[PDB]
Amino acid sequence: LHKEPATLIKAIDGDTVKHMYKGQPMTFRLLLVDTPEFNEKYGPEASAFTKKMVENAKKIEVEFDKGQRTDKYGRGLAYIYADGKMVNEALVRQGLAKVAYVYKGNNTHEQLLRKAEAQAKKEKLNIWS
Numbered sequence: 745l746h747k748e749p750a751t752l753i754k755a756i757d758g759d760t761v762k763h764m765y766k767g768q769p770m771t772f773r774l775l776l777v778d779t780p781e782f783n784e785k786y787g788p789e790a791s792a793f794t795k796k797m798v799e800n801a802k803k804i805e806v807e808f809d810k811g812q813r814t815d816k817y818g819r820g821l822a823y824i825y826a827d828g829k830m831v832n833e834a835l836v837r838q839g840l841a842k843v844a845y846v847y848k849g850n851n852t853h854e855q856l857l858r859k860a861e862a863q864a865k866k867e868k869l870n871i872w873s
């Protein structure tokens with residue numbers, strides 16, 4: 745896989761963010777995770793986590809996997825990096841997302857994320873508390 749440039753347009757919630765990609769606005773849904781909805785427990789905390797990470801970033805990058813690049817709502821499906829740190833992984837490591845939505849062929853970082861999850865669960869962090 746390869747990283748590609750994007751610039752933040754707006755943080756939306758824990759697992760959705762709007763970026764300008766190839767010069768066009770696109771809402772991205774983070775691959776391989778599920779954050780709680782804002783109205784659910786830890787949802788505001790996930791939203792705030794993601795927002796801080798992407799807002800403070802000097803450099804946003806998008807990384808598509810090998811499969812589907814957009815979902816049925818037209819959202820981009822990617823791994824998102826903030827100054828080289830993967831948002832998707834960081835959410836999981838902090839117990840602010842579960843590994844989820846693992847579809848065959850867009851699952852390159854699955855095992856990386858599951859390892860993060862296991863450590864968040866051992867630590868009894870957030871969702872796992």
Ligand SMILES: Cc1cn([C@H]2C[C@H](OP(=O)(O)O)[C@@H](COP(=O)(O)O)O2)c(=O)[nH]c1=O
Pocket residue numbers: 773774775776777778815816821845847
């Ligand atoms: C993360 C992800 C979600 N989706 C779809 C499945 C779910 O469909 P349904 O809307 O029919 O439940 C929805 C979950 O996203 P959200 O967690 O953002 O709601 O998005 C994909 O198709 N591919 C993906 O990789």
Ligand SMILES: [Ca+2]
Pocket residue numbers: 759778779780781
């Ligand atoms: Ca969600």
